[PDB]
Design a protein around this ligand. Structure first.
Ligand SMILES: NC(=[NH2+])N/N=C/c1ccccc1OCc1ccc(Cl)cc1
Ligand SMILES: *[C@@H]1O[C@H](CO)[C@@H](O)[C@H](O)[C@H]1NC(C)=O
Ligand SMILES: [Ca+2]
Ligand SMILES: [Ca+2]
Ligand SMILES: [Ca+2]
Ligand SMILES: [Cl-]
Ligand code: NA
Ligand code: NA
Length: 464
């Protein structure tokens, strides 16, 4: 039976009947609601006594890292600053059929929150949050990252990177923590989200946004590391996200890519109920295979080497919950992850106005890390340049798939270049990476800019 909650009709991205939705009712009708799954929101806290959250609240999925106590209750202020985690929690697991607000995507999942943004957010704070109770929490949702000013290059420092590797390796009984991540809100600053090391990570399942009418929202950042898309806000004729709000209220104006990641986390919760044995990599495969480009407008939809349409705004397209839970049920676990390291340069290369580096690779032929079926690929680049934001960088796979690694960033005046920065693309997923790869570095300005590429490491992940 369809939810009876008073605002469920306003949750157009779930309740729609016009095919502009996330196809969640189809998963609910297959019997999947999130029962037995545990999700945690890493944000500014969670109103655990909210009438639409209390029934699913899980103290075992929660902690207060900012004040160092178990209780993630938000700090109440006159401007309601610390409401975001409560909004995101309801998107995932707001209680259903209780006469309050609407429902969560996974309305029978258990939901917690980590209060970790309301304070000085250090590497240690991030690590302690990403690493919370990793054999109880299945899925983490994080909407935060480095400043979206269009001039920052930053990512997880050592403790947080260690937390990512521990989570995916030993978390969830060795199946791997699922870290769902928002790709950013820096669109009007012309931000380019591979410059955000959290969303650019292979260990995060990164999500962008589409407006109700199927367009790229003003706030969206394009990048090759994004995997897929959920609906969120757009212009003032387009509806927004409807969910739980601070002070036991219900909001119809939750917005941004930061509202897209929680919806993805709920869909992933339904999928994990359908197959509890999925690994962190399995889950990314399911997203790649089932997501839907149709009716998302972008001028960069390109067909990759295995016939999938991919966009830097949308990844593989809109998440499809019904298809995710269906494919999950008989999914065969992927083979162990291989990693093929190819150091490319024999000498430093002057960049000048334009540099092209071509290299034919065997992808570790004859070795235990031989890869014929790519998952993520990275170009780890070390270079100097006098104005970083004038650079644009592309990587072309042997199958001809052109991934933008970096778009021009007008505000990025930095003279510090890139220091072994691991630009990541999802767009060659399932391609055979043997053959010629091409790296393109271009000065997009008319200025006489200058610099040097001193290291190019092609890193291939995948299977055979
Ligand atoms: N790189 C990131 N992950 N940026 N995360 C940003 C973020 C995260 C949470 C809340 C707010 C945020 O940004 C402000 C904002 C909200 C909505 C809109 Cl529509 C625009 C901006
Ligand atoms: C989970 O997958 C692994 C790897 O394929 C397999 O060995 C194991 O039996 C599976 N467990 C369950 C409960 O299906
Ligand atoms: Ca507290
Ligand atoms: Ca409700
Ligand atoms: Ca950004
Ligand atoms: Cl690695
Ligand atoms: Na990611
Ligand atoms: Na192509």
């Amino acid at each position: 039976q369809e939810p009876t909650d008073p605002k469920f009709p306003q949750q157009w991205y779930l309740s729609g009947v016009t095919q502009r939705d996330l196809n969640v009712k189809a998963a609910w009708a297959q019997g999947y609601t999130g029962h037995g799954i545990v999700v945690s929101i890493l944000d500014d806290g969670i109103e655990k006594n909210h009438p639409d959250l209390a029934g699913n609240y899980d103290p075992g999925a929660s902690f207060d890292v900012n004040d160092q106590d178990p209780d993630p209750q938000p700090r109440y202020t006159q401007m309601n600053d610390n409401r975001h985690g409560t909004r995101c929690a309801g998107e995932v697991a707001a209680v259903a059929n209780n006469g309050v607000c609407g429902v969560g995507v996974a309305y029978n999942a258990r939901i917690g929150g980590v209060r970790m943004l309301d304070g000085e957010v250090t590497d240690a704070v991030e690590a302690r949050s990403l690493g919370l109770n990793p054999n109880h929490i299945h899925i983490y949702s994080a909407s935060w990252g480095p400043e979206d000013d269009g001039k920052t290059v930053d990512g997880p420092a050592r403790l947080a990177e260690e937390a990512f590797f521990r989570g995916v390796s030993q978390g969830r009984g060795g199946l791997g923590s699922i870290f769902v991540w928002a790709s950013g809100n820096g669109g009007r600053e012309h931000d380019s989200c591979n410059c955000d090391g959290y969303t650019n990570s292979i260990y995060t399942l990164s999500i962008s946004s589409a407006t109700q009418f199927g367009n790229v929202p003003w706030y969206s950042e394009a990048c090759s590391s994004t995997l897929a898309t959920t609906y969120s806000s757009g212009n003032q004729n387009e509806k927004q996200i409807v969910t739980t709000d601070l002070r036991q209220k219900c909001t119809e104006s939750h917005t941004g890519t930061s509202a897209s990641a929680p919806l993805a986390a709920g869909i992933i919760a339904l999928t994990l109920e359908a197959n509890k044995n999925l690994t962190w990599r399995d889950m990314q495969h399911l997203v790649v295979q089932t997501s839907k480009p149709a009716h998302l407008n972008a001028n960069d939809w390109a067909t990759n080497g295995v016939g999938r349409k991919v966009s830097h705004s949308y990844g593989y397209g809109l998440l499809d919950a019904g298809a995710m839970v269906a494919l999950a049920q008989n999914w065969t676990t992927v083979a162990p992850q291989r990693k093929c390291i190819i150091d490319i340069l024999t000498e430093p290369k002057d960049i000048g106005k334009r540099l092209e580096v071509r290299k034919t690779v065997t992808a570790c032929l004859g070795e235990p890390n031989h890869i014929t079926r790519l998952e993520h690929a990275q170009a780890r680049l070390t270079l100097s340049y006098n104005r970083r934001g004038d650079l644009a960088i592309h990587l072309v796979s042997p199958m001809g798939t052109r991934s933008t690694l970096l778009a021009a960033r007008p505000h990025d005046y930095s003279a510090d270049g890139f220091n072994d920065w691991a630009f990541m693309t999802t767009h060659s997923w399932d391609e055979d990476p043997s053959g010629e790869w091409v790296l393109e570095i271009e000065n997009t300005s008319e200025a006489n800019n200058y610099g040097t590429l001193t290291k190019f490491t092609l890193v291939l992940y995948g299977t055979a």
